[PDB]
């Protein structure tokens, strides 16, 4: 019940929302059908349009007008945004030469530059270039301020998950808005775009910026706007709030536009009908900037122009139907479209088996335009598993396609030519970022970055301490003139042991066998003390950020941090120069595993466990193929370099080690590789403790990794070799799932040169993703600034073209 007989006189767009059955005048009241009777009349005036004209100049104030051209309007803060242009001979902001804003130039009484976030739904990254002739305000923001060529959204590349990620710095799995549509089985409740259940706060985790601001004493405008409030009214309201008295005036604001997303769905991302929406957005920006300039706020406010996601070409004819794969198609519920999520229609149905559904959806048609996954097998870079609202079965859908349950669902609902929601590395899903103002840099281009990083920066812009989030705070310090956040390296928690020779051969009963001078004896000892370690450990040893027991093991060709708990290296580091040679494994050594005399039998793997485990085999972290000499090659067969590997996974690993590492070294002028295992049994994106491990090599305490990582580092300036690099680094990494089959790659019966590299690209990762998963901290000893290293650790090599 709403007693809509209260009134909105003097309460229009009130910042504190009032509690039913008192009626509402806030910018969401329309959406809850709860505005006071007089809201439209008082708060949504439109009389006489949105622009002063010569004749209106000087007029007698008439409170019915949408905006005013009287003399008193400035002090009231309710002039039309073009008043001074039309009535005082001033220029439009867009026509002014840009000038560096070295310091905030704010009116007295401002305690900090305000921040205005101008968010645009579906504003694809390439619009900045391709629409540049029709968006002159936006292009001035872009060229005069700080911009990225594009900004990476989060998966799924839908509106609500992305707006709320922008607001909180959290991955959807952590904030809870995992799609535009959702079932929570604990609530036994559904969430949709349409309707009331999305207004319930229990859907919305973390702490978004407006609440972070409020709790720390910074006042916030209301970010949300009901769809019927026209854009011109949203701008005027923001400008009005900015005219408020110091003790009431907010410091942070958001504008939101439904365009160009709304048109993009109907006409496609580059439909000729898309030029007008782009013009209109630009004109709204112009109105804001002119408005700010009238209030002398145009060199005082920080403005963020940001999108939630892009837009791709998609039509009804490009639909895969699950009815063409499953006989049982009515025993499932599909969340459909540009992704799929599948659960049972009924939990009472005990014959529903996700495994058989997955198999019926796997590599069934030669050009199949979706790929099914258990959520935990999705690429780790998507961070899309650790929420009860994300279904166990997921369909990653090819760009340009839709998935539906049955054909009736498509023609009983062609309408659309644009959609989004695909994989967040797809170019068409990329969006924009521009920062303009005293706190942003001047005429600066920054590299692409992910939208999870912005919450921290908006916090920095407002002098706030951010709630705990998934950004890496400092990785965007290079966007800012000042208010940088100066982080320190996390402290190492466990220090390594440096074991020497302590055990005799005959103390090992491992079931392992191997067919195996004073100048070259002193030599191999000094390789076991770490004489070549400057070569193989280029960026310092990783710091272990939890409590555990481990050993640093030196060798001629590689260095490792060996875990006595997990019985294998946490990391293995080695450098392969451009000049290096690949050799094969000689025959006498094919099944050779050698005891490591620095590590007790009791902290070693054994070969007999692998012999008895019919499913599990083993591989090596430092590849024997890249040994520097026949004598060094013996070190690669130490038991302490061994890790558990399914035969299906060895195909991948072997090809990566034998072929690809040499290739990258050749193309990048040497590489440093750090590889190791990852244990994420509960798919939370975080390092598992021992008691979380669900699988061991049969009959042993040898835990099985869920994934294998490698971090491949070289000199950004590739004319310098990786091991003699003076400047910025360049990195690519991956987190390969450790799977007993290659069902994920439909062409895996072919030669590895046709599918392995493609799999690795799919499983590209940020170093930061690996850190979370391992509890290690990399690049501790470089000659680069820590902020620069943080940027590098957040880098994702995506493998899309320009």
Ligand X SMILES: *[C@@H]1O[C@H](CO)[C@@H](O[C@@H]2O[C@H](CO)[C@@H](O[C@@H]3O[C@H](CO[C@H]4O[C@H](CO)[C@@H](O)[C@H](O[C@H]5O[C@H](CO)[C@@H](O)[C@H](O)[C@@H]5O[C@H]5O[C@H](CO)[C@@H](O)[C@H](O)[C@@H]5O)[C@@H]4O)[C@@H](O)[C@H](O[C@H]4O[C@H](CO)[C@@H](O)[C@H](O)[C@@H]4O[C@H]4O[C@H](CO)[C@@H](O)[C@H](O)[C@@H]4O)[C@@H]3O)[C@H](O)[C@H]2NC(C)=O)[C@H](O)[C@H]1NC(C)=O
Ligand Y SMILES: Cc1nnn(Cc2cc(C(F)(F)F)ccc2CCC(=O)N2CCN(Cc3ccc(S(N)(=O)=O)cc3F)CC2)n1
Active site residues: 159
Distance between CA atoms of residues 492 and 543, nearest Å: 5
Task: Tell me whether residue 258 is exposed, middle or buried, using C-beta atoms within 10 angstroms of its C-beta: 0 to 12, 13 to 18, 19 or more.
Answer: middle
Out of K ion, Na ion, Zn ion, none, what residue 261 binds, judged by CB under 5 to 8 A for its kind, is Zn ion
Does 383 bind ligand X (CB under 6 A)? Our answer is: yes
Nearest to 125 by CA among 113, 109, 142, 140: 142
| One of 26, 38, 173, 460 touching ligand X (CB under 6 A) | 173
290 is in an annotated binding site: no
Q: Where are the alpha helices (DSSP H) in 449-588?
A: 454-461, 518-529, 533-536
Out of K ion, Zn ion, ligand Y, none, what residue 528 binds, judged by CB under 5 to 8 A for its kind, is none
What's the start-to-end Cα distance of the chain, in Å? 54
The distance of closest approach from Cβ of residue 771 to ligand X in the complex, given in angstroms and rounded to an integer, is 9
Are the CB atoms for 127 and 171 separated by under 8 Å?
no
Does 695 bind Ca ion (CB under 5 A)? Our answer is: no
What angle, rounded to 10 degrees, do the helices at 786-794 and 767-774 form?
90
What angle, rounded to 10 degrees, do the helices at 454-461 and 159-168 form?
40
Does 772 bind ligand X (CB under 6 A)? Our answer is: yes
Distance between CA atoms of residues 369 and 346, nearest Å: 27
Binders of Zn ion among 249-268, rule CB under 5 A?
A: 261
Distance between CA atoms of residues 507 and 527, nearest Å: 24
| One of 77, 136, 149, 205 touching ligand X (CB under 6 A) | 205
CA atoms within 13 A of residue 780's CA, in its CB half-sphere? 15
308 is in an annotated binding site: yes
Task: Give the distance from CA 130 to its chain's centroid.
Answer: 25
Size of the site for Na ion (CB under 5 A): 2
Out of Na ion, Ca ion, ligand Y, none, what residue 686 binds, judged by CB under 5 to 8 A for its kind, is Ca ion
**Candidates 13-21, 109-117, 165-173, 349-357 — which segment interacts with ligand X by CB under 6 A?**
165-173
Between 451 and 675, whose beta carbon lies closer to ligand Y?
451
655 membership: H or E segment, kind and range: helix 647-655
Does 680 bind Ca ion (CB under 5 A)? Our answer is: yes
Are the CB atoms for 170 and 470 separated by under 8 Å?
yes
Out of Cl ion, Zn ion, ligand X, none, what residue 174 binds, judged by CB under 5 to 8 A for its kind, is ligand X
68 is in an annotated binding site: no
309 is in an annotated binding site: yes
Nearest to 512 by CA among 618, 396, 357, 377: 618
Nearest to 145 by CA among 299, 325, 360: 299
Buried b (16+ CB within 10 A) or exposed e, 563-573: bbebbbbbbbb
Does 624 bind ligand X (CB under 6 A)? Our answer is: no
180 is in an annotated binding site: yes
Out of K ion, ligand X, Cl ion, none, what residue 772 binds, judged by CB under 5 to 8 A for its kind, is ligand X
Does 744 bind Zn ion (CB under 5 A)? Our answer is: no
Task: Give the distance from CA 714 to its chain's centroid.
Answer: 23
The distance of closest approach from Cβ of residue 685 to ligand X in the complex, given in angstroms and rounded to an integer, is 3
Distance between CA atoms of residues 69 and 663, nearest Å: 69
Does 19 bind ligand X (CB under 6 A)? Our answer is: no
Does 312 bind Zn ion (CB under 5 A)? Our answer is: no
User: Where along the sequence are the contacts to ligand Y (CB under 6 A)?
Assistant: 28, 31, 117, 119, 160, 163-164, 166-167, 198-199, 223-225, 254, 256
DSSP code string of 219-278? -B------TTS-HHHHHHHHHHHHTS-TTT--SEEEEEEEEEHHHHHHH-TT-GGGHHHH
In the complex, residue closest to ligand X by CB: 205
**Candidates 218-226, 282-290, 326-334, 380-388 — which segment interacts with ligand X by CB under 6 A?**
380-388
| One of 468, 500, 517, 719 touching ligand X (CB under 6 A) | 468
Between 609 and 729, whose beta carbon lies closer to K ion?
609
- Angle at the Cα of 470 from the Cα atoms of 466 and 476, rounded to 5 degrees: 70
184 is in an annotated binding site: no
By 3-state DSSP, what share of the chain in percent is helix, strand and coil, each rounded to 5?
Answer: 30, 20, 50
The distance of closest approach from Cβ of residue 180 to Cl ion in the complex, given in angstroms and rounded to an integer, is 5
The distance of closest approach from Cβ of residue 769 to ligand X in the complex, given in angstroms and rounded to an integer, is 7
Out of Na ion, Cl ion, K ion, none, what residue 742 binds, judged by CB under 5 to 8 A for its kind, is Na ion
22 is in an annotated binding site: no
Site mask for Na ion (CB under 5 A), range 724-763, x = bound? ------------------x-----x---------------
Out of K ion, Zn ion, ligand Y, none, what residue 610 binds, judged by CB under 5 to 8 A for its kind, is K ion
Running DSSP on this structure, what letter comes out for residue 601? G
Query: Which residues are documented as binding site?
Result: 121, 159, 180, 261, 265, 308-309, 420, 680, 682, 684, 686, 688
Residue ranges that bind ligand X, judged by CB under 6 A: 170-171, 173-176, 205-206, 383, 386-387, 468-470, 685-686, 772
Query: Which residues are documented as binding site for 1-hexadecanoyl-sn-glycero-3-phosphate?
Result: 159, 180, 261, 420
Query: Which residues are documented as binding site for 1-tetradecanoyl-sn-glycerol 3-phosphate?
Result: 159, 180, 261, 420
Residue ranges that bind Na ion, judged by CB under 5 A: 742, 748
Residue ranges that bind Ca ion, judged by CB under 5 A: 121, 159, 261, 308, 680, 682, 684, 686, 688
């Amino acid at each position: 019940w709403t007693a809509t007989s209260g009134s909105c006189k003097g309460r229009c767009f009130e910042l504190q929302e009032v509690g039913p059955p008192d009626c509402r005048c806030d910018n969401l009241c329309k959406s809850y059908s709860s505005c006071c009777h007089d809201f439209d009349e008082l708060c949504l005036k439109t009389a006489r349009g949105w622009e002063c004209t010569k004749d209106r100049c000087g007029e007698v104030r008439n409170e019915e007008n949408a905006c005013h051209c009287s003399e008193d309007c400035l002090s009231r803060g309710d002039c039309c945004t073009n008043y001074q242009v039309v009535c005082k001979g001033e220029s439009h902001w867009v026509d002014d030469d840009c000038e560096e804003i070295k310091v905030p130039e704010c009116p007295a009484g401002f305690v900090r530059p305000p921040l205005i976030i101008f968010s645009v739904d579906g504003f694809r990254a390439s619009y900045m270039k391709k629409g540049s002739k029709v968006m002159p305000n936006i292009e001035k923001l872009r060229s005069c301020g700080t911009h990225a060529p594009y900004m990476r959204p989060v998966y799924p590349t839908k509106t609500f998950p992305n707006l709320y990620t922008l607001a909180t710095g959290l991955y959807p799995e952590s904030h809870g808005i995992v799609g535009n549509s959702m079932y929570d089985p604990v609530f036994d409740a559904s969430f949709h775009l349409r309707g009331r259940e999305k207004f319930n706060h229990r859907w919305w985790g973390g702490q978004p910026l407006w609440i972070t601001a409020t709790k720390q004493g910074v006042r916030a405008g209301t970010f949300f706007w009901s769809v019927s409030i026209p854009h011109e009214r949203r701008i005027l309201t923001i400008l009005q709030w900015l005219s408020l008295p110091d003790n009431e005036r907010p410091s942070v604001y958001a504008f939101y536009s439904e365009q160009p997303d709304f048109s993009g769905h109907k006409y496609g991302p580059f439909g000729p009908e898309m030029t007008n929406p782009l013009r209109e957005i630009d004109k709204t920006v112009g109105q804001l900037m002119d408005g700010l300039k009238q209030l002398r706020l145009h060199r005082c406010v920080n403005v963020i122009f940001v999108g939630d996601h892009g837009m791709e070409d998609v039509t009804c004819d490009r639909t895969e139907f699950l009815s063409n794969y499953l006989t049982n198609v009515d025993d499932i519920t599909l969340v459909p479209g540009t992704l799929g999520r599948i659960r049972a229609k009924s939990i009472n149905n005990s014959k529903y088996d996700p495994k058989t559904i997955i198999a019926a959806l796997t590599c069934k048609k030669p050009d199949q335009h979706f790929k099914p996954y258990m959520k935990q097998h999705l690429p780790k870079r998507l961070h899309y598993a650790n929420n009860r609202r994300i279904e166990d079965i997921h369909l990653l859908v090819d760009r340009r396609w839709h998935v539906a349950r049955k054909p009736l669902d498509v023609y009983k609902k062609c309408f659309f030519q644009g959609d989004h929601g695909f994989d967040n590395k797809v170019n068409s899903m990329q969006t924009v970022f521009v920062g303009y103002g005293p706190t942003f840099k001047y005429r600066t281009k920054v590299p692409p970055f992910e939208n999870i990083e912005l919450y921290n920066v908006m916090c920095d812009l407002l002098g706030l301490k951010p709630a705990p989030n998934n950004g890496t705070h400092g990785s965007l310090n290079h966007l800012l003139r000042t208010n940088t956040f100066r982080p320190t390296m996390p402290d190492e928690v466990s220090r390594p042991n440096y074991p020497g020779i302590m055990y005799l051969q005959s103390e090992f009963d491992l079931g392992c066998t191997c067919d195996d001078n004073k100048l070259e004896e002193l030599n191999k000892r000094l390789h076991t003390k770490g004489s070549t370690k400057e070569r193989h450990l280029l960026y310092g040893r990783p710091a272990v950020l939890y409590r555990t027991s481990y050993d640093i093991l030196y060798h001629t060709d590689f260095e490792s941090g060996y875990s006595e708990i997990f019985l294998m290296p946490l990391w293995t580091s080695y450098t392969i120069s451009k000049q290096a040679e690949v050799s094969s494994i000689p025959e006498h050594l094919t099944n050779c595993v050698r005891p490591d005399v620095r590590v007790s039998p009791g902290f070693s793997q054994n070969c007999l466990a692998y012999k008895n485990d019919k499913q599990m085999s083993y591989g090596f972290l430092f590849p024997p193929y890249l040994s520097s000499s026949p004598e060094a090659k013996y070190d690669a067969f130490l038991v302490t370099n061994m890790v558990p590997m399914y035969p299906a996974f060895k195909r991948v690993w072997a090809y990566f080690q034998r072929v690809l590492v040499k290739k990258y070294a050749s193309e990048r002028n040497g590489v440093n590789v750090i590889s190791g295992p990852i244990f994420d049994y509960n798919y939370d994106g975080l390092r598992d403790t021992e008691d979380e491990i669900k699988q061991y090599v049969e009959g042993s305490s040898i835990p099985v990794p869920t994934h294998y990582y490698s971090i491949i580092t070289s000199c950004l300036d590739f004319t310098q070799p990786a091991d003699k690099c003076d400047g910025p680094l360049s990195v690519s990494s991956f987190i390969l799932p450790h799977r007993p089959d290659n069902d994920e790659s439909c062409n895996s019966s072919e030669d590895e040169s046709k599918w392995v590299e493609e799999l690795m690209k799919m499983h590209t990762a940020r170093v930061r993703d690996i850190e979370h998963l391992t509890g290690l901290d990399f690049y501790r000893k470089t000659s680069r600034s820590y902020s620069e290293i943080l940027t590098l650790k957040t880098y994702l090599h995506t493998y899309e073209s320009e």
